[PDB]
Amino acid sequence: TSQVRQNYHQDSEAAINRQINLELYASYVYLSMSYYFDRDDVALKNFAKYFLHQSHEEREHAEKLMKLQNQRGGRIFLQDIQKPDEDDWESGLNAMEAALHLEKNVNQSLLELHKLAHDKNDPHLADFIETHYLNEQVKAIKELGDHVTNLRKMGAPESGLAEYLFDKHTLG
């Protein structure tokens, strides 16, 4: 038992390791999306920059959870980072839709983590999730929804013009 450990359930510790993996996974999905838009036959530079920024953010999310694990005296166990479910993300609209789906999955995982913390009467963990993760997820989901809506209304993905102009005026 860690000399610092206090009111930290083993289920919470395991859940934090799973969330670390999920955040690293999200980082990897976004990296893949980013360089898809860097392809010479896609060539939407601001889509690429947008998803690269997201990738680096998700890495920060993971590192803060690793720090949390050690803060509470839990022990980090890393697992493989699975490659994303696609190699070719099709279009700006499709990538944005996939990112929305991803962020809602991460959000669901965090809400389950919060539920667990509360069930185990761990207010420090509950508030850590509340303070550093829940509103970030709500903001990310809202932003992605906004982007999907505009791309759809503009005529994406069929209109290459639409994705070009969205890349310039929204993501640029």
Binding to Ca ion, residues 64-83 (CB under 5 A): 80, 82
How many C-beta neighbours within 10 Å does residue 141 have? 18
Decide if residue 14 touches its own copies (CB under 8 A): no
60 CB neighbour count, 10 Å cutoff: 11
* Residue 158 interface partner, choices Ca ion, its own copies, Ni ion, none, CB cut-off 5-8 Å depending on type: none
Question: Which residue in the set 127, 139, 142, 149 belongs to the binding site for Ca ion (CB under 5 A)?
Answer: 127
The residue type at 109: S
Binding positions for Ni ion, rule: CB under 5 A: 23, 54, 58, 61, 140
Q: How far is the CB of 153 from its own copies (least distance, A)?
A: 3
Give SS3 for 73: coil
40 contacts Ca ion (rule: CB under 5 A) = no
Q: Tell me 83's DSSP state.
A: P
The least distance separating its own copies from the CB of residue 98, rounded to whole angstroms, comes to 13
Report the candidate in 162, 152, 51 with the shortest Cα–Cα distance to residue 102.
51
Residue 39 DSSP label: S
143 labeled binding residue: no
In the complex, the smallest distance separating the C-beta of residue 159 from Ni ion, rounded to whole angstroms, is 26
Distance (Å, rounded) from C-alpha 20 to C-alpha 141? 20
29 or 42: CB nearest Ni ion: 29
163 marked among binding-site residues: no
Cα torsion angle, 86, 88, 90, 91, sign: positive
Q: Which residues are annotated as a binding site for Fe cation?
A: 23, 58, 61, 103, 137
